[PDB]
């Protein structure tokens, strides 16, 4: 599923990301935009043999288990397939654990490069929330 900007902002708000651990809602919408272009089925195979899954491109080496990545740690204790649903529940649950580490949203390279330091709230403006 490919979410609309406002559609995802509303969904993420319902999934408690309006002010989760110091991060405003715009951060999450902006991150999804540059990580997966709002596509829940997005996947990207990495050099180390790991794969990034879903709307928030969660990595198979540290967060989810896809059974095909070497030093997998499965920090989110969840199968990577669960992160490929049109339902963002699993991705949001895992993203919350990820951001609860001291590195915060820096875990998301696209967010770090295209969102951090920008007017992220612009990503939720012009939306019915």
């Amino acid at each position: 599923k490919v979410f609309g900007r406002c559609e995802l902002a509303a969904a993420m708000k319902r999934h408690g990301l309006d002010n989760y651990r110091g991060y405003s809602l715009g951060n999450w919408v902006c991150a999804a935009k540059f990580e997966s272009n709002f596509n829940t089925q997005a996947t990207n195979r990495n050099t180390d043999g790991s794969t990034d899954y879903g709307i928030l491109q969660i990595n198979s080496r540290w967060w989810c288990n896809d059974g095909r990545t070497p030093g997998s740690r499965n920090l989110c204790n969840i199968p990577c397939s669960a992160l490929l649903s049109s339902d963002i529940t699993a991705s949001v649950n895992c993203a919350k654990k990820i951001v609860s580490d001291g590195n915060g949203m820096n875990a998301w390279v696209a967010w770090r490069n295209r969102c951090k330091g920008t007017d992220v709230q612009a990503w939720i403006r012009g939306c019915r929330l």
Partner: antibody
Framework: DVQLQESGPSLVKPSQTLSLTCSVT????????WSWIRKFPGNRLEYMGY???????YYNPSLKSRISITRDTSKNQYYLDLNSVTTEDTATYYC???????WGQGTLVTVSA | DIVLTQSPATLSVTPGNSVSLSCRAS??????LHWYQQKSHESPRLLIK???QSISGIPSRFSGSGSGTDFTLSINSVETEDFGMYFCQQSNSWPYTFGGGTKLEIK
């Protein structure tokens, strides 16, 4: 499957450092975030803090920086140190993973002269 | 810190009857509210995560609802094994905090 268990002294003196150990069996401590929670005599629960995969820690400000949570990969254990304890630190201490799915049995530690 | 207030403090019920326990937050926490059960001489057990998400291995009679500042834990047809303490906990902001708890007893 995963199992957690606390160990350490059950009786300590005021002003000393209270130290507890949580032994994890079934999986590596490098595969989760680990926490410490305590229950006071009146059914009052307090989340003490946790250590995440990067080594970063989060401690409850209520503890006034008297707390330290560390890990030992080789022993697959993590620890809790609480400095300068007082009778207000008497409580049942529990270790559990960040998700809250796995908890230790809990251990009562009494602080008294 | 975010303060969680639970009510009633105590609730006596007859097995077979249903009950609802309340937890209100001092500020909006979205869906970041979890429910725990705790019996004497035992560690807490997670019943519901993120306000309404089910947990594998928990009886289906437990359900959670709410968002923002108002949350409820419902038990459809209380069983004897359900008597004990119930606590809500928020994970929206650090430090995580617990409500004062509600004691469920047999009437």
């Amino acid at each position: 499957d995963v199992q957690l268990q606390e160990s350490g002294p059950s009786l300590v003196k005021p002003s000393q450092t209270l130290s507890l150990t949580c032994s994890v069996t079934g999986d590596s401590i490098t595969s989760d975030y680990w926490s410490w929670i305590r229950k006071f005599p009146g059914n009052r629960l307090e989340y003490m803090g946790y250590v995440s995969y990067s080594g970063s820690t989060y401690y409850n400000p209520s503890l006034k920086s008297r707390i330290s949570i560390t890990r030992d990969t080789s022993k697959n254990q993590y620890y809790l140190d609480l400095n300068s304890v007082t009778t207000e630190d008497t409580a049942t201490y529990y270790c559990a993973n960040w998700d809250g799915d796995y908890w230790g049995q809990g251990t009562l530690v009494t602080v008294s002269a | 810190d975010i303060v969680l207030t639970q009510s009633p403090a105590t609730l006596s019920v007859t097995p077979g009857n249903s009950v609802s326990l309340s937890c209100r937050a001092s500020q909006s926490i979205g869906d970041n509210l979890h429910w725990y059960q705790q019996k004497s001489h035992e560690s807490p057990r997670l019943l519901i995560k993120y306000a309404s998400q089910s947990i594998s291995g928990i009886p289906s009679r437990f359900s959670g609802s709410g968002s923002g500042t108002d949350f409820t834990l419902s038990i459809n047809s209380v069983e004897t094994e359900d008597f004990g303490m119930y606590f809500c906990q928020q994970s929206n902001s650090w430090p995580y905090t617990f409500g004062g708890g509600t004691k469920l007893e047999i009437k």
